[PDB]
Amino acid sequence: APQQINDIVHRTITPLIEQQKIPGMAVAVIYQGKPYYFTWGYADIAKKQPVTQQTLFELGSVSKTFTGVLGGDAIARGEIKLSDPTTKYWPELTAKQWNGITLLHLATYTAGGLPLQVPDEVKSSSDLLRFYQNWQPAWAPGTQRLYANSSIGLFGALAVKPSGLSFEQAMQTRVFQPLKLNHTWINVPPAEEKNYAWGYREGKAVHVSPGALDAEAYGVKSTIEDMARWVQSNLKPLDINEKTLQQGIQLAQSRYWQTGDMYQGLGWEMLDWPVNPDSIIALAARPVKAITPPTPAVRASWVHKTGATGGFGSYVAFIPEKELGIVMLANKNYPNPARVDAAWQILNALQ
Numbered sequence: 001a002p003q004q005i006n007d008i009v010h011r012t013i014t015p016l017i018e019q020q021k022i023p024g025m026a027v028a029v030i031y032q033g034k035p036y037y038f039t040w041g042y043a044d045i046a047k048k049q050p051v052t053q054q055t056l057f058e059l060g061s062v063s064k065t066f067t068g069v070l071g072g073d074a075i076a077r078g079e080i081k082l083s084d085p086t087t088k089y090w091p092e093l094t095a096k097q098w099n100g101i102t103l104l105h106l107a108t109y110t111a112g113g114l115p116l117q118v119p120d121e122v123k124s125s126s127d128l129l130r131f132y133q134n135w136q137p138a139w140a141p142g143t144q145r146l147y148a149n150s151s152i153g154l155f156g157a158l159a160v161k162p163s164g165l166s167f168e169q170a171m172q173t174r175v176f177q178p179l180k181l182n183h184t185w186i187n188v189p190p191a192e193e194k195n196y197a198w199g200y201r202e203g204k205a206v207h208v209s210p211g212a213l214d215a216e217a218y219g220v221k222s223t224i225e226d227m228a229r230w231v232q233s234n235l236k237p238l239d240i241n242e243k244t245l246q247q248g249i250q251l252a253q254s255r256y257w258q259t260g261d262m263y264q265g266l267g268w269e270m271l272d273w274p275v276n277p278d279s280i281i282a283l284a285a286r287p288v289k290a291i292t293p294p295t296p297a298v299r300a301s302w303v304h305k306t307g308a309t310g311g312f313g314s315y316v317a318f319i320p321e322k323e324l325g326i327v328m329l330a331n332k333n334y335p336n337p338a339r340v341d342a343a344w345q346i347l348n349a350l351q
């Protein structure tokens, strides 16, 4: 592998692992559209199983980039429109605060303060309807962004209704299979458990807990090889042969709202490149400016998403104009700034 890539990667990641005490880690750099893989440490400390290019990590909220692309493919299919009212696809949501909240607001966390988490007591379709009917918005729709699994989670579940398919089945057949992500899962099958890393939280081995709208907001598990293929797909959507999927990827990198230097896509978040690295909190409410109409995917962007579960920390970033990207998967949820700093330190060296 080119020594320049070898070197910047190891010189950046080795100290990161040491400083953050990460038990195991996998990295992919995509350089001029080819992937280069790196692994360190342990998928399972007790059983002494190393991280390999086959090891499954919990992506946590990097899963939202798969939800946003599946929603983009459903739009491209003419199954849904982002301008549609939520109640078009859930006419049981009759409470009047729902008037004016569209699928775009759900997808981009702008519905008016839906909360970060669906409560752990919500366990049935019935409980779910009750939660959403009782929610009282803090703000009118389309005025402030508040990152929320209950917002993009509900977008994912509604976006697949016209198809007739479960969310998992729609993701499997419309995204994972076409892109050859054959070791990417919403539910890890028994056959694949030997490759499923443990996460580590305060030194204990943990896996993500089941919860309502989990698949949609934070429940995908993948390998470093499939995540490198996901980054290639998102850097070069025109190479993708399925027309609605190619389109869906483009829709998910469109710029819908701006807060500060950041633009909100569907799952993906974007800044203009070159991106000041210092530009790149339990609840952060920010007023947003609508981009009217959304800007189609900008090639000169830093496009990224960070993800966590209790035991895992993931990061993906890529720059379309430079055909360059990175994926970092770890089995400890370590601070986001350390992820961004390491990524920028690698990509800026190679760019």
Ligand SMILES: N[C@H](C(=O)O)[C@@H]1NC(C(=O)O)=CCS1
Binding pocket: 060, 207, 208, 209, 218, 308, 309, 310, 311, 333
């Ligand atoms: N640490 C994660 C977060 O910070 O969003 C969450 N963790 C979990 C979990 O570990 O079960 C579920 C919802 S995402």
